[PDB]
Design an enzyme around this catalytic site. Structure first.
Site, short mmCIF file in Angstrom:
data_model
loop_
_atom_site.label_atom_id
_atom_site.label_comp_id
_atom_site.label_asym_id
_atom_site.label_seq_id
_atom_site.Cartn_x
_atom_site.Cartn_y
_atom_site.Cartn_z
N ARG A 175 0.85 -1.22 0.00
CA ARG A 175 0.00 0.00 0.00
C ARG A 175 0.88 1.26 0.00
NH1 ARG A 175 -5.93 -1.43 2.36
NH2 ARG A 175 -5.54 -3.62 2.89
N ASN A 176 2.12 1.15 0.47
CA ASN A 176 3.11 2.27 0.51
C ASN A 176 4.13 2.10 -0.62
OD1 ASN A 176 1.94 3.59 2.77
ND2 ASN A 176 2.95 2.13 4.14
#
Ligand SMILES: *CCC(=O)N1CC[C@H](n2nc(C#Cc3cc(OC)cc(OC)c3)c3c(N)ncnc32)C1
Length: 310
Positions: A175-176
């Protein structure tokens, strides 16, 4: 071409920052566009920046602009300024999201970073799953094993750089990670020197994530965050990649997780994973931080496997 481009004066703006001409970008050359997702610290929006690229100074470029909400606190401002200043110190690499410039004068703080058209790695992988896996409405863009190794190798190179620049991520996960027009893997939220209160590793975040599933044991219990604790997270990131956007420890409640890891149980070998690659994942998940591989070793290992598969 509204009042976001119109300069702010002394006697209206709430705060003054210091200008670094090297980094400063003029507001009238920045055009704010569609907002990019909700959640995370502050707002991020698409924008067109004219001359942000010194290799094409007359060409408009698509960029992402991080800014504060209208109800942000003094600490929120400080935390954004610190994130910007740390990215200046860490410097540029292909496999990280890079600081392109900032608007610090004549209005609200804008931090301008590279735009990644293909979005985050989880949604990028899930969309490019073969037939036979959970998908919902391009066959050419479908992932191969070589692409999954290449993807892993790129993120290892990125983390090797960050680590060499004395940077500890503390929240490495799919997600990052963001993916650019040319399928380049770039690590995000690496500058955050943010201190947080109101911790809850049981309650799910906005988009249903439990960040504790990426945390090394010593990070949970002792709040010890090192390059070796980042390597554990890189292990869980490897799982995500070779399951093509798989959610880690699926259906395991947070209570059971701690007991499971204590007893020495780890996640199973993904379908697309090789025995060599799974032993790399399991090396990352060593209980003892000093028995985990370094990123220097992960890059050399992944470079070897990538030259072989090809
Ligand atoms: C914050 C909300 C979020 O998580 N999004 C995921 C997808 C979408 N999105 N976010 C970014 C970004 C960024 C960014 C900003 C800063 O500010 C200083 C630093 C950083 O790395 C350290 C990363 C997106 C980009 N760049 N492109 C496309 N979608 C993006 C919202």
């Amino acid at each position: 071409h509204h009042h976001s481009q119109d300069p702010m004066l002394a006697g209206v703006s709430e705060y003054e920052l210091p200008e670094d001409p090297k980094w400063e970008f003029p507001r009238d050359k920045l055009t704010l566009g569609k907002p990019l997702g909700e959640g995370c610290f502050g707002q991020v929006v698409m924008a067109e920046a004219v001359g942000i690229d010194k290799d094409k100074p007359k060409e408009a470029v698509t960029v992402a602009v991080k800014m504060l909400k209208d109800d942000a606190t003094e600490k929120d401002l400080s935390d954004l300024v610190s994130e910007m200043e740390m990215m200046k110190m860490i410097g540029k690499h292909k496999n990280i999201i890079n600081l392109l410039g900032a608007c610090t004068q004549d209005g609200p703080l804008y931090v301008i970073v590279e735009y990644a058209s293909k979005g985050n790695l989880r949604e990028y992988l899930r969309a490019r799953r073969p037939p036979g896996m959970e998908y919902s409405y391009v066959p050419e863009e479908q992932m191969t094993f070589k692409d999954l190794v290449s993807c892993t190798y790129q993120l290892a190179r990125g983390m090797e750089y960050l680590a060499s620049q004395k940077c500890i991520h503390r929240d490495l996960a799919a997600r990052n990670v963001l993916v650019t027009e040319n399928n380049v893997m770039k690590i995000a939220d690496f500058g955050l020197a943010r201190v947080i209160n109101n911790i809850d590793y049981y309650k799910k975040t906005t988009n249903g994530r439990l960040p504790v599933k990426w945390m090394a044991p010593e990070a949970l219990f002792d709040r010890v965050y090192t390059h070796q604790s980042d390597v554990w997270s890189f292990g869980v990131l490897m799982w995500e990649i070779f399951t093509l956007g798989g959610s880690p420890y699926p259906g395991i409640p947070v209570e059971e997780l701690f007991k499971l890891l204590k007893e020495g149980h780890r996640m199973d070998k993904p379908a697309n994973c090789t025995n060599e690659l799974y032993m790399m994942m399991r090396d990352c998940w060593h209980a003892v931080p000093s028995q985990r591989p370094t990123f220097k070793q992960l890059v050399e290992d992944l470079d070897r496997i990538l030259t072989l598969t090809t």
